[PDB]
Amino acid sequence: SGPVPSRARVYTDVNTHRPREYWDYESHVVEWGNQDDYQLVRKLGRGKYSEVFEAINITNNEKVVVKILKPVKKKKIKREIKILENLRGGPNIITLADIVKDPVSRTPALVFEHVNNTDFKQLYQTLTDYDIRFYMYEILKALDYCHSMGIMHRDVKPHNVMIDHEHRKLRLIDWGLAEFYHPGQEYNVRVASRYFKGPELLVDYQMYDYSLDMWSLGCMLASMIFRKEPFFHGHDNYDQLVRIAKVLGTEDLYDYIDKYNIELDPRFNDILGRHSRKRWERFVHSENQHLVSPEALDFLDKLLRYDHQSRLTAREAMEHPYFYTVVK
Amino acid sequence: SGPVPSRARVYTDVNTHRPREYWDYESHVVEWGNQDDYQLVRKLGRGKYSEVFEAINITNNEKVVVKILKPVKKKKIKREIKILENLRGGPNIITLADIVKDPVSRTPALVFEHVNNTDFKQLYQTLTDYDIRFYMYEILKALDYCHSMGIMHRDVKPHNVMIDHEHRKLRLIDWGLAEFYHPGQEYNVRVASRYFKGPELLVDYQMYDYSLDMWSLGCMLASMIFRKEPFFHGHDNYDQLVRIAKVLGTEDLYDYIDKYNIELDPRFNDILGRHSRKRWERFVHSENQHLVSPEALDFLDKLLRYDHQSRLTAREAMEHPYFYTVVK
Ligand SMILES: CC(C)n1c2c(c3c1-c1c(Br)c(Br)c(Br)c(Br)c1C3=O)C(=O)CCC2
Ligand SMILES: CC(C)n1c2c(c3c1-c1c(Br)c(Br)c(Br)c(Br)c1C3=O)C(=O)CCC2
Hints:
homodimer; 2 domains; binds the ligand CC(C)n1c2c(c3c1-c1c(Br)c(Br)c(Br)c(Br)c1C3=O)C(=O)CCC2; two-stranded antiparallel sheet; 9 strands; five-stranded antiparallel β-sheet; Phosphorylase Kinase, domain 1; 15% strand; alpha+beta
């Protein structure tokens, strides 16, 4: 019969009511800046798609971050540029300041506002209960904004959340995997990092939506309150779904694949098995108990659902009791 | 009430005093040459509307430039051909030598005189004050001629000015966006590159005229005397008008839209803000001061006005003190 279709329960048609130019990024024309305006100071890191440098805008002596792209389809570059320009000025969205043409790689280089990030492997160990609530709220601001603008990030994870902790400042970065949501569109399921892939990606259900990001957020939250980073630590995609099922239980998983008539890859047969849904109390211990509370567990439970349609929206999440004190 | 109409203050009726055939390009019949007269030597570049090749005319062994056109309405090809033929032989106008059509693919190719251009990214950094005055004067010759022939270029920018610096030769090229001026005609505002769009284009005032080109010229001049390319560096069309208003001030802008009863797009409301008119001295520094003079600033100020009717004409511009030494 084929899989049952699905639609986002919020922001479903926002791109259809936009002018064509907003989401038809293949027709976007890039206006290049002057690359001699920037001198590279030092390398900050390397990724699958890019190399990242701290640089100086010599016209005004301002610090910037330059992401020199590795070779990829021009269509994906246009997509990332168009999404960054659509989202510019939104709450906690990284600001694209310029686009130049690297003299060495002859590839594009994206210039971004600078952020003085504290590395998460050292930050998350020091975060208090209130810090986790605060930064979760900031991330939710960014996510609700981009979802309301018809865009899903599809790569939410700690490495893509820059935090200047001294100033309580947060930026959601790396939009190279983001896409425009259109109702009925089938998307590539090979997105996001393995530890943060939603079950819809792991069972190969292509008609997903904004709710994918929410699953990733839950994973992050799980790793923060239980002090286990990453929380679902699978060795591959199959073992990733297995690790998830050992916590969430197999009954809801099979109900999920039955509801959407999903054809389960045969390889799962001999590895999913039968697993009960566990209570979160089994992950609590003396070193993490100060971060775990009834409110946090209720919120986490409402994020980590197999059925993408049953997960909280970003706005619903922002209205949860877990955040009352942050809301002031 | 609607917008207040406008007319060019010079060359207003030149096309109406012409035979219909001069400006009625929709009825133009193309005189085709033989495509086998030309052999392509090498590719020189790629554009939005065309690909550009160096080629050899084998009947007379002469070097030429071939612009193979991408798919476009036949009426626009007729327009470009008719304008090129009307302007052929004019001062510093590129010469159209032939028009051919691949007998198999049926795609059209325009053949042009060859010019040994030095790319502006390397030329403009080496230009002296006198060089800038000289080449501005040459561009003004071309512009006054085409305006006097009832034609506005609508795409003036460095990429469309070919300069053979060894021979002090200059050609204004790429007339694919040019149009005939008719009093009372409303034109498409989606013309020119972002950084060179006049305010009339950005506020959607359709009854513009030759003076549009003058705004573009001012932009070029600014970037050359201040060594700042582009001068108005907007992120999009809206932010482009914002960049302009941060230099020329918002008060003259609102006086402009009041004079012509222009309906401002509501989105400008939250981005234009309040800005004072800046003095040009803020763009002068140790690396460009040898190119900036009182005469240059006076001329520039008289080019970059919101009100298109208050900008210098090409001839008035040619009579400015900035050019006395060039006039000899
Ligand atoms: C972890 C760090 C080295 N980093 C990486 C990336 C990016 C960064 C980074 C930092 Br730090 C800052 Br601050 C800003 Br602002 C911006 Br934008 C970025 C960015 O895009 C990748 O895209 C992949 C490789 C890792
Ligand atoms: C920058 C260069 C490669 N170039 C481009 C174009 C054109 C040229 C060019 C050159 Br050089 C010369 Br010499 C002559 Br003569 C003429 Br006519 C042209 C011309 O029309 C485009 O139209 C768009 C793509 C870039």
